[PDB]
Amino acid sequence: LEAKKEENLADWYSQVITKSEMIEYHDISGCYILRPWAYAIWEAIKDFFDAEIKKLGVENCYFPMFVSQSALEKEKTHVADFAPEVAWVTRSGKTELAEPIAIRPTSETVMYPAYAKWVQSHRDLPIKLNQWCNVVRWEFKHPQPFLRTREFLWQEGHSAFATMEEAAEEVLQILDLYAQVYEELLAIPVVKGRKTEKEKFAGGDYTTTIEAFISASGRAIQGGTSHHLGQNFSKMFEIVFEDPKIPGEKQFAYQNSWGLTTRTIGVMTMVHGDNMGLVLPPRVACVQVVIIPCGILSEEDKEALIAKCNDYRRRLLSVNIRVRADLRDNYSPGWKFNHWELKGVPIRLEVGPRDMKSCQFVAVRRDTGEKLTVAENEAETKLQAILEDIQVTLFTRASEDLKTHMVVANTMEDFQKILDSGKIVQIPFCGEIDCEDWIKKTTASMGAKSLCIPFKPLCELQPGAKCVCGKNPAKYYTLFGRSY
Amino acid sequence: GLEAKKEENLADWYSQVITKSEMIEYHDISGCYILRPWAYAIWEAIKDFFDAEIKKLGVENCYFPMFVSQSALEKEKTHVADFAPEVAWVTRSGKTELAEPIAIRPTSETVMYPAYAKWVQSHRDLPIKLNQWCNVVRWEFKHPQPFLRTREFLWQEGHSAFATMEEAAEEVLQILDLYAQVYEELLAIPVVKGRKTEKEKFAGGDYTTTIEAFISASGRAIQGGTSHHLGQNFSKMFEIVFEDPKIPGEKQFAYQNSWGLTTRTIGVMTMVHGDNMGLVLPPRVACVQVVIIPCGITNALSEEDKEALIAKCNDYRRRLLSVNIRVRADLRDNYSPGWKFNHWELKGVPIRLEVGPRDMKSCQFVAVRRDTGEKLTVAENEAETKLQAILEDIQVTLFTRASEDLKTHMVVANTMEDFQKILDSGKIVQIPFCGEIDCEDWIKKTTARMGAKSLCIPFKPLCELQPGAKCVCGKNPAKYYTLFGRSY
Ligand SMILES: COc1cncc(-c2cc(F)cc(CNC(=O)c3cc(N4CC[C@@](C#N)(C5CC5)C4=O)cc(C)n3)c2)c1
Ligand SMILES: COc1cncc(-c2cc(F)cc(CNC(=O)c3cc(N4CC[C@@](C#N)(C5CC5)C4=O)cc(C)n3)c2)c1
Ligand code: PRO
Ligand code: PRO
Ligand SMILES: [Ca+2]
Ligand SMILES: [Ca+2]
Ligand SMILES: [Ca+2]
Ligand SMILES: [Ca+2]
Ligand SMILES: [Cl-]
Ligand SMILES: [Cl-]
Ligand SMILES: [Cl-]
Ligand SMILES: [Zn+2]
Ligand SMILES: [Zn+2]
């Protein structure tokens, strides 16, 4: 690892994700290989999230990757937004197809004709389905691994309800689960909010979001999204049922969709990584503890040291810690030290002949670098205690970043200065698309975009507050900033 | 309730079963099918088992891109020649014609192996053992069939690379026995392990091992899972090379395997065990193993007694869930008990637990086996034990019947005429076979006078080949007993 995170963030990022063996490049730009070290993080996210949505009554399924042109076009605003980056298959071999078929950029238009078939009466609702799959958004802008890619893995849940109230309830439940993914699994603090009219999902009624801050770049990124689609799709796909109270009155289902992608891993890298490499929160780390023999002497001594390393390995497995003993004669201890530091293993467990003589070992925390000498007696307990402290510590520092870099401004001048110091800003906002474009133009390296209207803003909007445009009154404190 | 009869028109019976059990929904693009939760849960049960098993072997999961460039796709000419006609090509994004067309993986050898070549620079970088759970596209213009032959399907594909032949050889057979376990232990489907003939092997591989299942209603066999030894054919083309100090200066090529299993599994499960009442789920993979159905009422039933029966149903739900049996209590007040009986029989739930008032105060219940229809009266106390005992017995029973089918419909013939007779009986035949591609073509066309295809060369044939035995063609000596039959 040669580039420094605070001097060239992009070269740093590329080096960190490849040398930690998370990502490999592919010969088709914007598509990245998820090697096991990254894929394991995705599997930990999947385990937690899939269990949580099962408790809500969501079931997993799998819908086709291809959508017909006429299904794709049924919801005019949705298709208008996605059509420029929809990839089209036009032949198999050299045989042109009867009609071009599209790869899903998102599955609303694949799933909802089926929903219309399945909703025959109000008894058939709710429908609550989720799929873990890949989607393709073939934009020609520059990709960035994890954060903005042409193919990505995600989960997308689609729910249909007989009542708007039940749908509005699920929207926030799912958003709170996304916040838990970031804050409890990834140790990343996020801000819950709603998108402005300009930024909301096309075809939806409103979009709720969690926003994460990457202080290295002073930029925010959306981490997960939970939309209320209302009746905009059900009226176009005829997901209908007869009103139970009133004979012959047809009603349209109320729908939500919600998504979360492997962008998570990238945010995790950008927030916690350092100049020694990846830093893994213990909750998602493939390997939580790596055991490494040091020193290295008698044949009996070397055999006894390896035996002690495996005593530690087994007693850690005894209490469900994910542990690897790296007992390779190939590489020196210092080499392995920096290799596993590069991969972000929370704890390095060092066992040398002297410490083993003294019935103790050394535990080295990846986040702070602190070396603790621990009696062998404590091993499982202490290490668990340390892993929890690492998780909290990561969260705490990132929270202090967010608190430091998210502030209120009530004037465009204050706004601009704070923005150019590398922070995100909550300003009073009129909500109009034209004024949002004006903000993006006059704050331009990029202009600031709206990130979200926070559920809980830093300050109370005072009666009669003007927007920063000055022309119209303010409707809400809105978090603005530069965005990935 | 089912209309079509399995023994009358298998195809319409199959479509009826897969839709009315809520496994499959049709899509407006032909050859692609929606896997509804009922089917997807079977796939996830197979996934749980197989993923744990290959983790014990050292395989790690990952995810490679869906797209492959033309350059990569052509590098192993046999493989690309075999797949080219059914590779789907993306040619534009929106209305922007792409500079270069890009292909969707029909299989990921040509996606993964350039990366493997980058990662292997020494013998210590081997072995590489990766697996992905993903979707692939084979866009063939023939008639698709849900689960069995589809244009897009879910699968797992594992790709491993080794410094030596011996370890690769070992993995081929290990994975094959895992597939045999998926079929025989999870899905209660008996299979025959064997090696594909030269004509039927994976193009560009060295040899292909296979498990074949028999569908007696059709009299046809089908490949259930596959495990290839690729040898060095792909590593020489993608330069997956390494140097070892044991052999100075010689760049050695990795020995590779790839192995795949798809949602075809579920189709075979349907074709083998389904009956004229609908699906039949082996308890090992059943989303719901026991459905509890209050069948003590109509809308005229008392408000108090309704509450009592619903509470007893929830009692059974809690007990069964407490000993991890997968249970649904269907307490929907809006459907009648007979509607629920039919619904869950259609979906193949192994045990129906009926709770009525008279039995509810004789402290008993009724258990109805989906495979045999037998009704049993059970004391309340035996609930969690009894029902487990029945589930086990259903699994065994399904497997036993299936094996008695296979044992009855797989026989030996030694000349072409017995072979033709037996084959038209709706059976599959082990014959002495020379192994040659021309002769396998001849067998296919003469037997159409569709024709029989080779299914596999059994590891364990029914009989031992005589010394000097000649093939059923007569022109060359037989080299092995080979399982032939009409095939899906
Ligand atoms: C908008 O200006 C850009 C600037 N710089 C680069 C690009 C760009 C370049 C590419 F080569 C390819 C693409 C296409 N991929 C994506 O747009 C994208 C979106 C998301 N998203 C969007 C919001 C969401 C959340 N939460 C939703 C749940 C889904 C979430 O995760 C995640 C990923 C991995 N990729 C964009 C575009
Ligand atoms: C061969 O003449 C035909 C006759 N009638 C119809 C077709 C046809 C029609 C289509 F519309 C689409 C397709 C393409 N899909 C498939 O070829 C296919 C193969 C497999 N395979 C192949 C063997 C394997 C095993 N074990 C390998 C692990 C992979 C396994 O599961 C599984 C599935 C679900 N689909 C074929 C073709
Ligand atoms: O693309 C999106 O944002 C929504 C959420 C998942 C499904 N569609
Ligand atoms: O398609 C096949 O048959 C092999 C096995 C999975 C990957 N390639
Ligand atoms: Ca767009
Ligand atoms: Ca109306
Ligand atoms: Ca001591
Ligand atoms: Ca072919
Ligand atoms: Cl077509
Ligand atoms: Cl609108
Ligand atoms: Cl909040
Ligand atoms: Zn304004
Ligand atoms: Zn012959």
Ligand nearest to the CA of B81: 8
Among the bound ligands, the one closest to the CA of A246: 6
CA distance A248 to B213: 51
Amino acid at B250: E
Helices (H), B182-250: 233-238
The token pair that represents A296 in the structure block:
């290295």
Q: Technique behind this structure?
A: X-ray
Can you tell me the distance from the alpha carbon of A453 to that of A429, in angstroms, rounded to the nearest whole number? 9
* Type of residue at A325: A
Phi and psi at residue A425, in whole multiples of 5°? -135, 135
Subunit contact A151:B40, Cβ cutoff 8 A: no
Which helix or strand (DSSP H or E) is residue B394 part of? helix B383-409
Of B261, B231, B326, B337, the residue nearest B293 (C-alpha): B337
User: On the CB side of B193, how many CA atoms lie within 13 Å of its CA?
Assistant: 17
Alpha-carbon span B459 to B195, nearest angstrom: 7
State the helix-helix crossing angle for B264-273 and B37-56, rounded to 10 degrees.
110
Instruction: State how beta strands B327-329 and B290-294 pair.
Output: parallel
- The identity of residue A19, as a single letter, is K
Phi-psi region of A378 (alpha: psi -120 to 50; beta: other; left: phi over 0): alpha
CB A146 within 8 A of CB A265: yes
Residues of A in contact with B34 (CB under 8 A): 61-64, 114
Distance A252 CA to ligand 6 centre (A): 9
Q: How far is A292 from chain B (nearest CA, A)?
A: 18
Burial class (CB in 10 A: 0-12, 13-18, 19+), A314: exposed
- Nearest C-alpha to atom 17 of ligand 1 is from which residue? A148
Residue A215: both structure tokens together: 């202080």
Q: Whose CA is nearest to atom 33 of ligand 1?
A: A148
d(CA B188, CA B171): 24
The C-alpha atoms of residue B485 and residue B216 are separated, in whole angstroms, by 12
What separation, in Å, do the N-terminal and C-terminal C-alpha atoms of chain B show?
28
* Residue A47 CB contacts under 8 Å (≥ 6 apart), including other chains: none
Nearest to B275 by CA among B488, B43, B8: B8
**Cα A406 to Cα A482: distance, rounded to the nearest angstrom:** 12
**Angle A9-19/A263-272 helices, nearest 10 degrees?**
110
Give the residue from A478, A456, A458 showing the smallest Cα distance to A404: A458
Looking at the CA of A434, which ligand is closest? 12
User: Are B192 and B212 spatial neighbours (Cβ–Cβ below 8 Å)?
Assistant: yes
Task: Quote the CA–CA distance of A252 and A460 in Å, as a whole number.
Answer: 38
Q: Which residue has the tokens 């990795």?
A: B254
Bridge partners, residue B376, by sequence:
B367
Of A68, A89, A133, the CB nearest to B89: A89
Alpha carbons A272 and A213: distance in angstroms, whole number: 12
Tokens of B268: 């075979």
Copy the structure tokens of residue B411. Answer: 């026989």
Residue A279 contacts residue A17 (beta carbons within 8 Å): no
Which amino acid would we find at residue A246? I
Q: Which residues are near ligand 2 (CB < 6 Å)?
A: B 31, 138, 140, 142-144, 149-151, 153, 223-226, 260, 262, 264
Within 10 angstroms of residue A371's Cβ, the number of other Cβ atoms is 11
Interchain CB distance below 8 Å, B89 and A90: yes
Q: How far is the CA of B475 from the centre of ligand 13 (A)?
A: 6
- Mutation pick from A59, A81, A89, A92 vs chain B, by most beta carbons of B within 10 Å, is A92
Pairing verdict, β B255-262 and B152-162? antiparallel
B292 residue type, one letter: I
The answer to whether the beta carbons of residues A223 and A208 sit under 8 Å apart is no
Q: Please give the Cα distance from A242 to A237 (Å, whole number).
A: 16
| Distance (Å, whole) CA A17 – CA A277 | 8
One-letter amino acid for residue B252 of the chain: Q
Measured in whole angstroms, the distance separating CA A476 from the mean position of its chain's CA atoms is 26
Comparing CA positions, the residue from B409, B440, B448 lying closest to residue B426 is B409
Contact residues on chain B for A138, CB-CB shorter than 8 A: 90, 93
User: Residue B113: which of B299, B226, B241 has the closest Cα?
Assistant: B241
* Helix, strand, or coil (residue A275): coil
Could you list the beta-strand ranges (E) of B217-346: 220-231, 241-244, 247-253, 255-262, 290-294, 327-329
* Cβ pair B56, B177 in contact under 8 A: no
Reference B127, options B57, B176, B51; nearest CA is B57
Pocket lined around ligand 3, Cβ cut-off 6 Å? A 106, 156, 201, 225, 227, 257-259
Q: Of A201, A257, A255, A259, which is closest to residue A232 (Cα–Cα)?
A: A255
Backbone φ and ψ of B91, nearest 5°: -120, -5
Question: Do residue B93 and residue A114 have CB atoms under 8 angstroms apart?
Answer: no
* Residue B245 DSSP code: T
Q: Which of A42, A71, A92 sits opposite B88 (nearest CB)?
A: A92
| Residues B159, B201: Cα–Cα separation, whole Å | 17
CB of B107 within 6 A of ligand 4: the answer is yes
Which ligand gives the minimal distance to the CA of A157?
3
Sheet of strand A219-230, all strands in order from the earlier edge strand to the far edge: A59-60, A127-136, A151-161, A254-261, A219-230, A206-214, A191-194, A449-454, A476-481, A424-429, A406-408
Select from B89, B95, B137, B334 the residue whose CB has the most chain A CBs within 10 Å, as the one to mutate to test that interface: B89
Name the maximum alpha-carbon separation found in chain B.
Answer: 89
Documented resolution in Å: 2.0
| Helix, strand, coil share (%) of chain B residues, nearest 5 | 40, 30, 35
How far away, in angstroms, is B136 Cα from ligand 8 center? 14
Identify residue B336 by its one-letter amino acid code.
Answer: S
**Which residues make beta-bridge pairs with A323?**
A289
- The β-bridge relationship of strands A406-408 and A424-429 is parallel
Q: Give the orientation angle of helix B264-273 with respect to helix B383-409, to 10 degrees.
A: 90
Residue B208 DSSP code:
E
Please tell me the distance from the alpha carbon of residue B359 to that of residue B352, in angstroms, as a whole number. 15
Residues facing residue B375 across a β-bridge: B368
Q: Which residue has the tokens 């209050």?
A: B294
Task: State the CB neighbour count (10 A cutoff) for residue B286.
Answer: 26
Query: What's the full length of chain A, in residues?
Result: 484
**B64: chain A residues, CB-CB within 8 Å:** 26, 33-34
Nearest alpha-carbon partner for A228 in A257, A252, A200: A257
- Number of A/B CB contacts below 8 angstroms equals 156
Task: Report whether B364 contacts B379 (CB < 8 A).
Answer: yes
B353, B319 Cβ separation under 8 angstroms:
no
Q: Cα(A15)–Cα(A274) distance, rounded to whole angstroms?
A: 12
Q: Which two tokens stand for residue B250?
A: 């010689």
Which residues in chain B are closer than 8 Å to A84, comparing Cβ atoms? Answer: 93-96
- Are A89 and A103 within 8 A, CB to CB? yes
Contacts for B105 with CB less than 8 Å, ≥ 6 apart: B64, B65, B66, B67, B68, B111, B136, B137
CB-CB neighbors (< 8 A) of A34 in chain B: 62-64
**Residues pairing with A347 in the sheet:** A289, A365
Greatest C-alpha distance within chain A: 90
DSSP B410-428: EEE--SHHHHHHHHHTT-E
Could you give the C-alpha distances from B445 to B218, B305, B439, B453, in angstroms and in order?
A: 20, 69, 10, 10
Q: What angle do CA A345, A346, A347 make, to 5 degrees?
A: 95
In the chain, the amino acid numbered B297 is I
Angle at alpha carbon of residue A149, lines to A277 and B72, rounded to 5°: 95
Are A103 and B85 an interchain contact pair (Cβ–Cβ within 8 Å)? no
Q: The tokens of A323 are what?
A: 């542990």
CA of A378 to the centre of ligand 7 (A): 12
- In the structure encoding, which two tokens stand for residue A10, read together? 């992009």
* Euclidean distance between CA atoms B257 and B235, whole angstroms: 11
Distance (angstroms) between ligand 13 centre and the Cα of B479 equals 9
Helices A379-405, A263-272: crossing angle, 10 deg rounding: 90
Contacts of B304 (CB under 8 A, 6+ apart): none
Residue whose entry in the numeric block shows the structure tokens 């993923």: B51
How many C-beta atoms lie closer than 10 Å to residue B392's C-beta? 12
Please state, in angstroms and rounded to a whole number, the distance separating the CA atoms of residues B155 and A136: 19
Residues 6 or more apart in contact with residue B129 via CB below 8 angstroms = B57, B58, B59, B60, B158, B160, B161, B171
Give the 3-state secondary structure of residue A96: strand
Counting Cα atoms < 13 Å in the Cβ hemisphere of A227 gives: 26
CB contact under 8 A, B89 and A86: no
Q: Which residues of A touch B111 (CB under 8 A)?
A: 26
E-strand ranges in A75-143 read 87-92, 95-103, 127-136
Between the CA of A228 and the centroid of ligand 12 the distance, in Å, is 25
